[PDB]
Amino acid sequence: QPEPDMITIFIGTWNMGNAPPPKKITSWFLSKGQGKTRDDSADYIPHDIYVIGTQEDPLSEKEWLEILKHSLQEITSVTFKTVAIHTLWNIRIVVLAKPEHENRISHICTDNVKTGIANTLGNKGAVGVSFMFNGTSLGFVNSHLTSGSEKKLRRNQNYMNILRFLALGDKKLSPFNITHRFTHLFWFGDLNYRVDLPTWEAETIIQKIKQQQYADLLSHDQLLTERREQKVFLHFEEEEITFAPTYRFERLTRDKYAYTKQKATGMKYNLPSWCDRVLWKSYPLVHVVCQSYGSTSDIMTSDHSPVFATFEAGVTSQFVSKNGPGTVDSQGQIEFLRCYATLKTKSQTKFYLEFHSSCLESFVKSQEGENEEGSEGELVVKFGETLPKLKPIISDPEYLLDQHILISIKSSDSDESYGEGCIALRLEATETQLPIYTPLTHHGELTGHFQGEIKLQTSQ
Numbered sequence: 019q020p021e022p023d024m025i026t027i028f029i030g031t032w033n034m035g036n037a038p039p040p041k042k043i044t045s046w047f048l049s050k051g052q053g054k055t056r057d058d059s060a061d062y063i064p065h066d067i068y069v070i071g072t073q074e075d076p077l078s079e080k081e082w083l084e085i086l087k088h089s090l091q092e093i094t095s096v097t098f099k100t101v102a103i104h105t106l107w108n109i110r111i112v113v114l115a116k117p118e119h120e121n122r123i124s125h126i127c128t129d130n131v132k133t134g135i136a137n138t139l140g141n142k143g144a145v146g147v148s149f150m151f152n153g154t155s156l157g158f159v160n161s162h163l164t165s166g167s168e169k170k171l172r173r174n175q176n177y178m179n180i181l182r183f184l185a186l187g188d189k190k191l192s193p194f195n196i197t198h199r200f201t202h203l204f205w206f207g208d209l210n211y212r213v214d215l216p217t218w219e220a221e222t223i224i225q226k227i228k229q230q231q232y233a234d235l236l237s238h239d240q241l242l243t244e245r246r247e248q249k250v251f252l253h254f255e256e257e258e259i260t261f262a263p264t265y266r267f268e269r270l271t272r273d274k275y276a277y278t279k280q281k282a283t284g285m286k287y288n289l290p291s292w293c294d295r296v297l298w299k300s301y302p303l304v305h306v307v308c309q310s311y312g313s314t315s316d317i318m319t320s321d322h323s324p325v326f327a328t329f330e331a332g333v334t335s336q337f338v339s340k341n342g343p344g345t346v347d348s349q350g351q352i353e354f355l356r357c358y359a360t361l362k363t364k365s366q367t368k369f370y371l372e373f374h375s376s377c378l379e380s381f382v383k384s385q386e387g388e389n390e391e392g393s394e395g396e397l398v399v400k401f402g403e404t405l406p407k408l409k410p411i412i413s414d415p416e417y418l419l420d421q422h423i424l425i426s427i428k429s430s431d432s433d434e435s436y437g438e439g440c441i442a443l444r445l446e447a448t449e450t451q452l453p454i455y456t457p458l459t460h461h462g463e464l465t466g467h468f469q470g471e472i473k474l475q476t477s478q
């Protein structure tokens with residue numbers, strides 16, 4: 019039975035509106051409704067992994083597990099294994115996997131972050147799950163961010179708090195937040211970003227939706243505009259939206275957007291919006307293709323419609339050689355040449371690098387680089403040809419070219435990271451000096467750049 023090189027992952031996000039679901043929700047797991055939908059011919063084909071994110075979920079974990087498992091079994095005739103379930107307040111994440119994956123899945127982590135302070139702490143935040151699938155790390159975040167058209171700044175702050183404080187993945191990757199810890203990261207939920215148009219335009223917006231004309235609406239989507247100005251979700255992908263806004267509906271139909279201010283809304287308008295979203299971020303040159311992204315038309319218990327997205331995702335085997343794991347493979351080495359970091363920092367400390375990778379027995383600290391003044395004010399840290407030679411555990415190119423090196427640049431004075439990034443070893447050539455490049459981030463904001471040349475030696 020061969021180990022896979024590809025899996026399909028289903029991501030669902032639904033704000034249930036504190037209402038139990040209808041008896042049939044199979045349309046969700048089949049990616050049927052509006053947008054980029056799944057072909058009929060695939061309906062009996064199970065996804066390898068189903069990650070279900072809910073918000074305003076009124077069910078017990080047991081009640082929702084019963085509905086989810088029975089739903090998938092009806093569709094696929096497969097009895098899915100529960101990998102993880104985590105619930106913060108009414109925010110919930112469920113990971114289900116095909117039974118043949120049970121002994122491929124290990125190192126399962128769960129965590130939550132509560133966002134806000136005093137007034138604003140009590141119901142918003144994120145739940146998450148991470149695990150290894152053979153040699154591939156996977157993380158999943160379900161976030162319910164701050165509501166309200168006039169709170170996109172709050173939403174961006176909620177995002178930065180979740181990505182700083184959600185403790186998933188390999189704790190040995192201590193310089194690195196969840197946006198660097200996984201081969202594939204999926205971040206979904208009721209992100210709560212709104213179509214920023216005047217309240218007087220509501221009926222015009224509704225008109226535009228009935229005509230399936232979304233272009234002039236998406237140009238005002240706060241998530242799309244905030245991402246374009248690099249305020250939020252830096253270096254995440256989102257598939258093109260081709261489905262009507264998923265909020266706010268009158269319940270028990272989809273024929274009406276309920277946007278007018280009411281006591282129940284705190285006297286706030288809820289203009290039709292894409293509150294309900296799936297974004298991802300994969301390590302450089304790993305296969306990840308979105309195969310669906312849409313909303314259901316036929317689940318109407320909530321003022322939100324469910325959103326599905328499906329993904330082909332590249333996975334690797336748990337590699338064993340004669341040598342590593344348990345030693346180095348002297349036939350392998352990773353060399354950095356002519357490397358410099360550019361940092362936006364005003365500080366004057368010395369910097370050193372840390373190289374972290376599952377292809378190394380443990381992380382490698384460099385010597386300090388040489389600080390220069392850049393033309394336009396910047397700090398440029400020069401490493402030149404000083405950087406330590408990295409000793410992979412396995413030299414087999416079938417392993418090593420599928421790996422990645424995480425880079426942190428750290429203050430000698432404080433040992434704090436000023437920047438994190440990632441280099442793919444999926445090079446055009448081995449035993450050849452080749453350009454490498456990663457942006458550097460800290461708390462998921464741009465702090466600089468790292469570039470140079472790599473020279474990779476493999477057993478071939």
Ligand SMILES: NC(=O)C1CCN(C(=O)Nc2ccccc2)CC1
Nearest residue numbers: 099100101102103119120121123124
């Ligand atoms: N949060 C909990 O109560 C857990 C959830 C289920 N579980 C597992 O071990 N699930 C599992 C592990 C590896 C591969 C496939 C499935 C034990 C208890």
